[model samples]
Target chain A: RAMTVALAIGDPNGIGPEIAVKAAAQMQPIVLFGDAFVIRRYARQCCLMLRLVPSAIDMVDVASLPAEAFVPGEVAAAAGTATLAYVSAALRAARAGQVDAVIACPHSETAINASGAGYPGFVAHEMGMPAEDVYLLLIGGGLRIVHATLHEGIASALARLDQRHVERAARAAVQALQLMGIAHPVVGLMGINPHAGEGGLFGRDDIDITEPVARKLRDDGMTVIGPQGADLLLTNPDIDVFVAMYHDQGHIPVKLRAGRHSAALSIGAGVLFSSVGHGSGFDIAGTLLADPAPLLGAIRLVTTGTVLA
Target chain B: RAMTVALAIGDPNGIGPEIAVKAAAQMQPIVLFGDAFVIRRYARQCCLMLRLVPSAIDMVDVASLPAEAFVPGEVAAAAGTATLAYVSAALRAARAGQVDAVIACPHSETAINASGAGYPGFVAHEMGMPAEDVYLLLIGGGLRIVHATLHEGIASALARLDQRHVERAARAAVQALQLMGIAHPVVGLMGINPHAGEGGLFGRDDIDITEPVARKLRDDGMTVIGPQGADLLLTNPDIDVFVAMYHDQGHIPVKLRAGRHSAALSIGAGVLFSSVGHGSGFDIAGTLLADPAPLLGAIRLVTTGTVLA
Candidate 1:
């Protein structure tokens, strides 16, 4: 049997439904999770039939958003609540062993925060795991990089980084690659400082933090490569996955190579999950001016079991 | 009249002389500055005539390296001393207005430091300027970037970075672009943090450091684009040059795009100066198996007045 993936529409008021429907129409074994009316509207526009039958598109309607509140470009409390409802429903399905993987479309942080639900901005926390346990793995341009610390200030990230953080991210990367069908994956750990502290000339962070982690991972029987410079490590083709110490160290290369075509996977949550690397298009939400290539890339990544360019 | 660039042959035992000779043979209006015997041996191997006549290669023979001490593929104090002598001679010629620019090949820090002279590891200090005044401007893949802080740990770079450092780097980038033939260059300043602190959600460093600097640069009668994220700012084609806050922020994008076919310029030295972005090939030095593509690229960059891929 083929792997089953639950596709969750991110925000009803964003371009989520349009891209989700458009992407689902082209792939198989996908069970779409969204409001029935919203999915039906886009399905009609995309000229695709949605049914429970195996021959047509599958859907798990959650009847969350009202038909009157479906303004595509507007950000409202109802739309925000509906976005989480869709994700929650998808998570339930995955927890019930009904799907092998789950892919959530783009969600607006403003809309979510405005709903007064006190939303934690990560999928791992919602899935009953500590947010730090889940690492962001970006797959694009034939490179898969996991960020040990992300979306924080460099100073704060550096101050809080430890051997455990590096180990967790590297282990998550190896597990994610294994889930992607690689039997044995090689992980490369990028240095915390330039030239991995240039042998303590730059700083002692890499020597104290990443070096021990790499050695421990090697002793634990993992094929680990580096605590070297990110720029130099990225050029090697043999590295299956690279663990970046910070945001720009990981993002610059991937974004430069793939642009908007990258797919981001949130790993270490005990379930396969991914989301589009870009945001939901509020400006062109209803006009359908959004490109579904990234969403499609995410879907193909979870379904085909290979990271593609 | 064509601009004459003085070519400084770095370590005599490294592949500097071989590549310098090879790169100079393909270009004109170039004055080779190195030991007379070292240049002659490579010139003969390359089957090129060396003479002071304009029709042949121009030579400013600085007698530094002895014939017996000119063993390639070796790192020695004699080779190191000769390397500095060649560069000193070249700097003198540039200082005398004998050349419009200077390009130093490659030098081994191990060899130079072994020679017992304190090497500052920067061309700016060698040129009698404060080390912080000169910035590393990397040009490749149709992008030019200047580093505000380089070759240090992220924490140190962040802690020591201030408004003055940002202003100096931005000014240097503007000047470097002007030297590259862009009359009025637009400088984009990359944030010290992700998303330029994401409006202080990440940190206030960008808000405090880069924002004011960008405003000041724009007010100083220069075109400035950002204090935005490096990843986001790099995607803008209209940005003539980018001021990177750190090393990886500047190097990753260029190295990923150009992959070692890049040229590095040391700006703000009051003279046009450049160096090949790679190391001295000690392994392939005497074998003459060095690729002069990067050297030629640097030569073309200073001469033709344009940044190429």
Candidate 2:
């Protein structure tokens, strides 16, 4: 069965519309969710014809962005508001069982925050789940790594890291793998400390936090490995998913291998949400110079379950 | 001028001597530092002729391990004591300007510690330097990364990281690059926290630690970049060397790219010492099934300045 992914055109004033149209032109089973005018503008520039017959390019015709305020290469509040509206509507469709997944294109945080709509910063927050429950599963370069803690200082991350967080990340990773059609997925938990504290010689965090979590997951009938060194565990080929303790542990290997082609999935929110790895190219937004390879990669990832080689 | 790198056969009971002789057969200007019996045994097994002639294979003949105790694939205290003897002799020669650099093959920590000689666990201690003074500079996969703090838990590593340690790592990296013929190496300092603390939103560690270190290095008239995210900084091509804040940050990229072919240099001790990235193949020690590619890679790194492609 073909999976239908709802594509939210992030920040109509940015390159979201442009690349979204280009990606839709290359693939099927993708429904763009954005203002009709903005989607039409990019489709015309991309030399792609939009259709409502369900056989060609389709859109949700979200009337969020005002036509006069649809200028590309700008960071207008209206564009930001429209971005959220598109994402919200896509989430609604996903919740209604109309789509299998959702992929939000690159958004302008500055513009979004300027809209005074109180953006929660992540799709998980919008989905009414605690931020800690949602894990960022980065898929690229033949690796799937979920970060337990991200976007913080190592000290604070260490202080906040516990068995609960590690277990949540691991469970979320397993759920994501199952969603991708793997009935039984092997989860590899990266140690918080080097060599997972070298068996308490380095630190007790791994022993106290990740080791128990691994055992608990195993008791729940899942194949879990590690609480080992991130560098060593990353070399293993049998791991279906790896739960990194922090950002660099997961990001370094994926970025080094996939570069800008990776896709990040926000898991554990009931709705499978993803975002393009790269940001909006405002400078090239309306110039038709923006590349849709990453966007297409994201769409293919959610639709066909094809990971980067 | 061809550089001479003194090779210390690491554990006599392991695959060190076997690989050392094989590597010597493939390169020149290398003087083996170990017991005469062990060196000759491997040379005979490797079907290579050993000579005292300056142009051919030469040995230091430390006479550390007795003939009866020189059994391959056996982790004995005598072989462990012999391992340190070989390295100590090589370090002496390096300090006396007998060789341009020193390369130690894989060693067994269990054997060395069991010998009751109180091994310091690193070549830096053997060279009379504090463990913090000598940083591990990993060179492979077209990248050179030096760890500011390694082999410890993240919490402890963060607690111990300060301006002094980061500065020492940066200085050591620059010096090592200069030795490798990079006269004006540009140093990239990876942020301790994600996004270098994301300007204090995440943590102040980067702003307080690495940022100042980078500024100080730049003020000293050296080209320094970042204090940025390690994952982001690694993508830049202009950086000649990178200073990673911890173990996984440095090890992941190199190991992911170079695998066992990487070489680790102990810098800042002035001896220019390196160890093979792999461990002792104790299981296949006497069977002569060990691969010498990694040992030869380390040799070429020191002798010809050829990094992994």
Candidate 3:
């Protein structure tokens, strides 16, 4: 019953390689996607016991352009290209059904853009899986993911919003919960309009637009509540999780109050997988694994509902 | 140097008169604006010592009319006409420079509408001044007076927002700070666009439209911030207060995080003022004078900065 998860070691210069190695060594039988030559050369400098997990570290060597490209401190184009290629490779492998999951290591936002990759997370609306589809589920004791309307001002966020966005986002939330092993997850969808349209006095969109969406989802036999205002929705215990309309609505409450221990998990996989929300540590990549309590905590935290409902 | 104030007891059924009486008893010389006979009857039934201060409790005499003319709860035509007249009288006193302030008590929102008063606050807006020139300032600790749009949807709030709103709001903020007696108040004006427009990353309106307004204000020798994100502007301690672009944007941060002992003040006049930002205490308004603590705290709290700063 071992579900194979292919891991992408993003940004060889950062903590990605070190965490990937640490994760593979601890959890036997994970298919690590990286370059063995670079990992072996790097691991020799550290105290990690790589014997039991050699099979786990399947370093698929793509290219070897320069040592500085893989070095931790410097930002090299080779590292950028490699990190993205690794993610694309794992994503392709997962799509082809080669693995049940693909947990990627952290990559630089700058690197993704600098690499001239087809998509940067900010502008990932086109050329990639529309940023809308890629739900960035940040997990902690609670979950905080975006309901994205990425490319405009406050108006665009409002314009992109409607009942359909609510319904689909709710549906996606339910799907995420189901993956986490919830038998029947109750989801709350937040109002696009303030006060849920103030009973249609303030704005008709929440009452007229968002409420219909909630009703439709309920009629389709989903456990969902609201069109409730965004601020009020998150405080409910009955709500297993909820959907918000835009970046800040979802982000502020979570990140402002709690983000240090939390992390973003790529949730399309049946097998839970992720890396720290922070970016790569180029200077410390080859340094001592430097106590991975945080990395382990992130893994344990993200995988909590994996086996149990 | 005692200032004379007009106290309009809000509703007969809904604790407005009682709380008004309770709040005003400490601050004598208040012109209690309501039906003198109605108040006397209530005082007699409750066996209370209700001294309608002559300077404070001037009679509108609506209570002397027949029961048919005065529907206590419902909005009868007589009640409508009389309430309008009462408000009109208070405004006249305010205009003629008789009363220094008017703190309106809580009333039934529906009842006010039923009276066909059009907008209850409209009368308050026209108090001793031109209606169009009047603006609202919501006060708690420092201040959170809105600029772009108040009481409108995001769409309209956005549409109505222009250079004028930004400039006016900033100047009003400066005046408010002056009212509060803060010399050289550091003000932060939030952008209509998120991330302070992030150089057109989010929206162009804030960077293109809003920034120039702020720049002009700065040129006018005011210390202003933003064209910054709303979130940043709120948390920045160096900034004294915020000028919000929309209703919730302004209201949310303050209401959600306001200290328990703190109360909201509806600010306009130092000359003729109102201690609003709360509801009528139906339970304890008349029967128990309770502590004048909440109202006293609010009234004192609004002016404390004047003394402190």
Evaluated with lDDT, which candidate comes out highest? 2
Native-referenced Cα lDDT, model 2: 0.80
lDDT of 2 at A177: 67
Models ranked on lDDT: 2, 1, 3
Per-candidate TM-score against the hidden true structure: 0.79, 0.79, 0.75
How accurate locally is residue B32 in candidate 3, as Cα lDDT from 0 to 100?
Answer: 64
DockQ of all candidate complexes? 0.65, 0.67, 0.26
**Which lDDT tens digits does candidate 2 get at residues A148-220?**
8877776767777888888888887776666677779989998888887887898688878899998999999
User: Alpha-carbon interface RMSD of model 1?
Assistant: 0.9
Model 2 misplaced regions, further than 4 Å: A9-82, A105-122, A275-295, A305-309, B9-29, B32-83, B105-122, B219-221, B275-297, B304-309
Docking quality tier of model 2? medium
DockQ value for model 1 = 0.65
- What does candidate 1's lDDT look like per residue over A31-114, in tens digits? 889998888878887675687423237888888887888888788888888888888888777777676678888888888887
Q: How far is candidate 3 from the true structure (C-alpha RMSD, Å)?
A: 6.0
Model 1 chain B weakest 10-residue run by lDDT: B117-126
List runs of model 1 lying over 4 Å from the truth.
A9-29, A34-83, A96-98, A105-122, A274-297, A304-309, B9-29, B34-82, B96-98, B105-122, B274-297, B304-309
Q: Residues B137-240, candidate 2, lDDT per residue (tens digit)? A: 88788888888888777777888899998998899778766766778999999988887788788878888889888889999999999888888899888998
Model 3 per-residue lDDT at B305: 28
Show the lowest summed lDDT stretch of 10 residues, model 2 chain B: B117-126
